[PDB]
């Protein structure tokens, strides 16, 4: 016999999650034959070729002898890279083009939720009492955003065209219109200073590590709510749980952690004054997903050419 | 020997103290207190009454009132409920409520698209979950009303990327926004929309217009905002279609009384968020201005500005 190729789903997502994928990528992928890690015999894990990730395990993915290279669902690999560099198997992220406008979106979307009181008006929900807050238009409300590249731009964008007072902050010097853009590690605590929400969207590096310490939380006004779409270590988490307790920081909507997901005993989970969000504010919807990982496929299987992988 | 001014709210007493800082310097030569910092004696005082829902058992302690100043833009309510007094009540056009409101439309449609009831009930459940996401521009808007309120709406629900349809009893063509006109074509609107958006007047033609029957054609698990008034939408069958699953999640901004009392079941609803009627919220430093203009034409020429009836 011609021995045959296939196509593993190595998730540990909920089965309910990693079925939704599967369906999607059968539809993206007819003719591959792509079933659940779980799913297979020790024979047909050995026919395969290519892992189709999100969060695997590395003992299902050690499993796969003969394994080629590996496509992620996610955006951000970061963990994986670290978890997996050691496999000798190209990594290719999930790069969808359209992330910078569904970032901006969420930006929005989220500086909405916090802008109209959506959280209090839940809290007193749940105590069944009415009551109307303060409303004051976006014009007289000032917006951070941290970082501005590719991303924090188009946020920023989104937020000026929204009506909000927007305020920008970069390490290097940018210039957006009708935002008002603050350039280095000096101009940093007076633009925090000016800033009722906060949005960041900043890198992960060595200058940015622990940027957001109890010092520079301090900077902000008092009820001053913040929005956490760039990484876990930007913001010190403990500094941060002082401020929400103390009342110097009103809200949090928080959708990136150092350990995701998030263990059940985070305190992030309980507080009152955090919404916590499953790592989504820029994830593609999965069609779109799932036909880049097939385009990437289809040209594997006609060229053997891997994907740009990650170092 | 003076006049004064009285204002009478139902709102939380931050609220209220809000807007009398507001007024206070839009209308710095009159003397405004709320209402139950008056004596028997200071309210006797009273001729204006500026109001937001107010009791109408506060506005009757006070006698010698002449006219009454509403904080909100419909007071269809008002008119009716204080017909009994016959003195007119001016109601307050002000310009950024269309902005404000279209806004709150924009607002509340990203709080279903994108998950948030969802992802909340999560968190309280301590449950890591990310939720399908589809585009804007495969998702289905629909707005009830197109007149100046419900076409703002529309059309930043349009520029946000939704695929956005519009009804209204009139014919309107709004660019970029798929307009449907008369009772004939409702159903027709309701069969396609995932996400409708409710700002219509109360009128003969609208009461119980969103039934049993009505809720029905709508897909199955549509997401509703109600930012009308309560009339427009059957409780009862609402709360129906919300536990069958026909409907799944209901945004409730507007309620006959006012403050929603204890008992009303729509609190305790997991598929029902409540909000005590932010769809009256305006910056109260435009709106201020706009009492002072007429109550400062009042103070000089004796005329009542524009009432209804």
Same mark, same amino acid.
């Given at each position: ?7 593993? &789903? ?28 779980? =799913? ?51 990594? *290719? ?59 924090g731009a188009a946020a920023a964008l989104r937020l000026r065209d929204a009506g909000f007072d927007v305020h920008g902050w970069s390490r290097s010097p940018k210039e957006i219109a009708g935002v ?8 940093? =605590?007076?633009m925090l200073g000016q800033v009722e929400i906060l949005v960041c969207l900043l890198p992960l590096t060595g200058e940015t590590r622990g940027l957001l310490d109890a010092r520079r939380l301090a900077? &902000? ?5 913040? *929005? ?6 930007? &913001? ?61 496929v289809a040209d594997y299987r006609a060229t053997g050419r891997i994907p740009p992988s990650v170092d």
């Amino acid at each position: 016999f011609q021995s045959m190729s296939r196509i593993a &789903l190595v998730t540990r997502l909920s089965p309910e999650a990693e079925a939704h994928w599967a369906g999607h990528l059968a539809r993206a992928l007819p003719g591959e034959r792509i079933d659940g890690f779980r =799913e297979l015999s020790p024979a047909e894990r050995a026919e395969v070729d290519i892992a189709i990730v999100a969060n695997p395990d590395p003992a299902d993915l050690a499993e796969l002898p003969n394994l080629v290279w590996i496509h992620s669902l996610w955006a951000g690999v970061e963990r994986l890279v670290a978890e997996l560099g050691h496999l000798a198997r190209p990594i *290719v992220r999930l790069v969808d083009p359209e992330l910078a406008r569904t970032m901006a979106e969420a930006a929005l979307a989220w500086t909405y939720y916090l802008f109209r009181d959506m959280p209090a008006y839940a809290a007193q929900q749940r105590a069944r009492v009415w009551k109307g807050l303060p409303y004051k238009r976006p014009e007289r409300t000032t917006v951070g955003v941290l970082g501005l590249g590719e991303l924090g731009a188009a946020a920023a964008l989104r937020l000026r065209d929204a009506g909000f007072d927007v305020h920008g902050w970069s390490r290097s010097p940018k210039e957006i219109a009708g935002v008002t853009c603050h350039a280095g590690e000096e101009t940093l =605590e007076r633009m925090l200073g000016q800033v009722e929400i906060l949005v960041c969207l900043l890198p992960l590096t060595g200058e940015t590590r622990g940027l957001l310490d109890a010092r520079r939380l301090a900077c &902000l006004p008092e009820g001053a709510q913040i *929005v956490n779409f760039a990484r876990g270590p930007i &913001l010190d988490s403990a500094a941060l749980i002082e401020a929400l307790d103390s009342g110097r920081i009103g809200h949090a909507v928080l959708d990136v952690f150092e350990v995701e997901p998030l263990p059940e005993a985070s305190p992030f989970w309980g507080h009152p004054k955090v919404t916590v969000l499953p790592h989504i504010s820029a994830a593609t919807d999965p069609e779109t997903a799932s036909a880049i990982v097939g385009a990437h496929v289809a040209d594997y299987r006609a060229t053997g050419r891997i994907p740009p992988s990650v170092d």
